[PDB]
């Protein structure tokens, strides 16, 4: 399962088959110029390394695949490299043929050679010997280097400690170890709300019992409403939360003074009504008391929660429910003093006010996604009767009312309370009872039994019996649950918005409460326009008659008014090129039907995409999973851009898979969004630290690392081409074979690999303090093809220098030694050239590193020293044939060191001078920030500084 | 649990320096390198000017030289004496034909007289100089046998069917004997006979003596060894058949360990100009005077318009006389100085503030 598949997948490239052709040409069709038994070492070692590493890859995958944009640019780079190698070999062959044309030379005399008529044959042999000569110009270690670098970057992303969430015991486990650098170019983020931005634990906040609306709270949607209006939300909330904390303390005190509860726990109490805790005793009398107790009893009975002992203490219960809202209701009913324990063969057990009492549940018409309600008939002993209690939606209940048994005095005020809760941003419920005397209950029970006795899709008869029986109800009131944001979500959102990332939030909540929660999350802020595409009656009757054209009119107006362009293919093509952060501070808000009708047709899709190209913030309300996937793919496919999609659950999985980067929010249970993702973080907050720090880092690291490589190898390779000019392109090597293999195996590999692994322009603290540094990665400036072409031109020039400086030290009289003895063998000029080239390349890498850390410095020094030591060790062994004492004869010549130092100076002077001219008179943002860092502007921030952590100390400015 | 190990390496918080290059830091380095490189370049150039050389190309002897002494044409010699920048005193040469030798292509003796007006220290090197002899071609350079060089009695298969380094075109003769020094390299050796002394024309009682013991690295005697062949399995290369007209008998087999002109030849010059030491003198200075060198023409070069010559020097520590190192050190130091001056000019004219947040690409617009 390893050897066949791995060796085939490895040889499926062009570089690998090229080197295999080279091995076969050196061994099977040997012309006579090769050391074949050892020329097969680079191929076999890279094959073994890739085989081991891919074995580890598949092992990690066991216990679809994506590719970054850098990889496709890398394919194009390798294509240009091969074009250059072919041009070199073409010129070699042509010139060797034109040479063998000549009719009087040293060869006819001393080489036993003849005039091979139609010299094109020797030209062809020379082409195929130069193909093997210019080995090192084939990028063969490039792919294994990029793979090592990406694996190391993903291991750093994993083993980062500021991403491990201690509550979940879940570090940021990467599921794709080759998109780290794609993390550094994110330009759009698509984020589900309910599970991602808000901790998906619903807490019961308020309730309107018998027209009395108990409950006081400061919700994030209320805070957002206050912020949008203009009130100082900071002081408003400080006062409100202090008041409510004092009220909660006194509420728990009064609750303890009321009665002794065995299942009371103040830590998970969320009902904050001092009015309720005071009115339960005597404040309104007996009728409101009875209403409240009946509300609590019905809330604590009508449910499907299964309770089990707490692993810490067996007396505490865990309240294991299926839906969060039912769990919240039963938990608050327990904490108020109506606890529910156990589940016997008949009914259930409630501890009310401290005493046990059992019930008899007969028929639980369970909750269904299509019924939108959960009902239950309990037997009340005393002459027992039937109590049909049903919990559902407000409209669901208001559709099923009785023509007489409605107060219509409590109903109006309860509806007002429900509307106020919906405005404040809470999920509302409705609860309705029905009292059934003994005779009518006997009749209805026999009818229900004979109706359920009908099989063959009993659901139809069941729903018709439900329609017949639940038409008359007596509503008691409503509840309200709250979904709080996760810790640090507003800070993370403002960080990602300063970084230049456009943010999309895909909600399931109503438009106005979504806008309020956005203002609370800082997705939208003040001095930011809200372009709404609501298809409400006020815009319908003013624009058109039917939808799907009101939205088109609205898109056209919001384009033509707040910019000067209209939806067109040329405007799409133009905006495809720009990535600048938009100015003007606009935002879009769109409903589910409007999004559907904007995704329907092609021109409307074009207009919607051009409008959302600007408008750094976009809110979509009441969307579907299909719509999530559709908007992600519309933003990605057209307008080719890098997209991240973060979510949880089972619809955000379809949202995640159709995106460049997919981030899953891990719950206490492993979910599909986690599994079918690319990365998996504990909380949305961590997305800031990931995307900025690592994103940017990886992106820069790869960027600067790739041209480096394409330059380093070039130097060496091209030097051989230059020796071609002086040996008439005949195919003799200027380098020893161990030199030609180790220049890529050991001499110049670790410097560029460590540049790609460990480099940091600014540390993580500055990365998170000045997030705008991300904008360059958004704009795609650190990695183009022009950068690679400039690095290759520099490599060509440095190869010219590294060859023609030793050649020029020889050219006068071929005596370069102090004792007049000879060093004129071509392996010795090759030692000259190789040492100059290696030291130039490693010092280039060092000068282009941003951070000179001791690991990188040690290994650059070791690469240079290993060049010197390999020369010294291979010479001193007699097994080197014509290379016997290259070390003791070259490193002991002052000519060698003179050329060495001046040639390294001449190789590094143009690039260093240009870098100085840049850092002086056209500095970039990271250079300005590094100067501000040297002057000490970032000294007060601690080393590990996450500005998105609530339990963190603030700084001066 | 699964908490990642807090560690200075895995958290990427290694000890490091972050070198930002401000003019106050770079310009001093530019000036320092400029100063040291200008000083070293001037020192190298001044120490190099003191190097005197004599080059004489005698390939045109068999046709231009006569039986009586005559001036050498100005194209064939190059004198460089630093005390006397205007010293021509053209050398002379005379050809002594040898009708006994039947190799009409190159035979006789070239006698050259040259007048050195200054001494030559105490370590004098007399190299020969081949021009346009292509000793760097693909098949040539690989045509020898490291099994014979090391002294083995390698059979025909070890000598012929070895790997890349093998004497293929000259592996065997017609009679069935392996060429002892095989291959195009050892076969095409340089053949002129150089004298063991420089005859003094004025005072013939003090002749300047030369040697051929010490013209090659001593370490090379660990790689070359005396053969173990049997004088019946070996025969001279096709071109050594004037030096061994009867073949190898029990006495004439060439011991390549103590034969350093061979060892110098088996090191194929990388480029088109070949300069190999052939004579040395490590004891006596070469006093000013008129000296005579008698070379026995054996090696043909006019077939391919090549050149052969003598090159007599004392040398230097950087080898012969070559102004490239000093010139390029001076150019490097002066380019560093020029660039430092240009950067300082543009700084004192249009120099921004260093740590100014107001210059950042977003705080600007
Ligand atoms: C010194 O080295 C000379 C350089 O090789 C060498 O010249 C070579 O001499 C051989 C004969 O000794 C010639 O061989 C052929 O000569 C003619 C012309 O083809 C043929 O009739 C012969 O049968 C034989 O095949 C080489 O051609 C010749 N090499 C060159 C380049 O001309 C001298 O012989 C050497 N002399 C001494 C004294 O060592
Ligand atoms: C210096 O070298 C010259 C080279 O010729 C020597 O002169 C030769 O000496 C020998 C004696 O054995 C004579 O047979 C030659 O005729 C001389 N040649 C010439 C051209 O004069 C001279 O002997 C050497 N000096 C010393 C002190 O030995
Ligand atoms: C320089 O002096 C040294 C030592 O006197 C010479 O080396 C010796 O030379 C003789 C022949 O002249 C040899 O027999 C010895 O084996 C050499 N010994 C060593 C240790 O080298 C050397 O030849 C002199 N150089 C010149 C040019 O005359
Ligand atoms: C020397 O060679 C040159 C170049 O061919 C020629 O013009 C000149 O006449 C020659 N001198 C003698 C003396 O042969
Ligand atoms: C060995 O060969 C050489 C070749 O020049 C010859 O001069 C010498 O006399 C030979 N020795 C014997 C013992 O035959
Ligand atoms: Mg969700």
Author numbering:
A (entry chain A): 205 to 267, 539 to 857, 863 to 884, 887 to 1439
B (entry chain B): 50 to 414
What do the authors report?
P4 ATPases are involved in phospholipid translocation: they flip lipids from the extracellular side of the plasma membrane or from the lumenal side of internal organelles to the cytosolic side. Most P4 ATPases function as a heterodimeric complex: a catalytic α-subunit containing 10 transmembrane α-helices (TMHs) and a regulatory β-subunit of the Cdc50 (cell division cycle 50) protein family containing two TMHs. Dnf1 and Dnf2 share the same β-subunit, Lem3, and both are also capable of transporting PE and GlcCer.
Due to the lack of interaction, the A and N domains are flexible and are visible in the 3D maps only at a low display threshold. Finally, the Dnf1 and Dnf2 switch back to the E1 state by auto-dephosphorylation. During this switch, the A and N domains become flexible again, and the TMH1-2 tilt back to narrow and close the exoplasmic substrate-binding site and open the cytosolic substrate-binding site. It is during this last transition that PL1 in the exoplasmic site is forced to flip and enter the cytosolic substrate site, replacing the resident PL2 there and leading to the release of PL2 from the flippases.
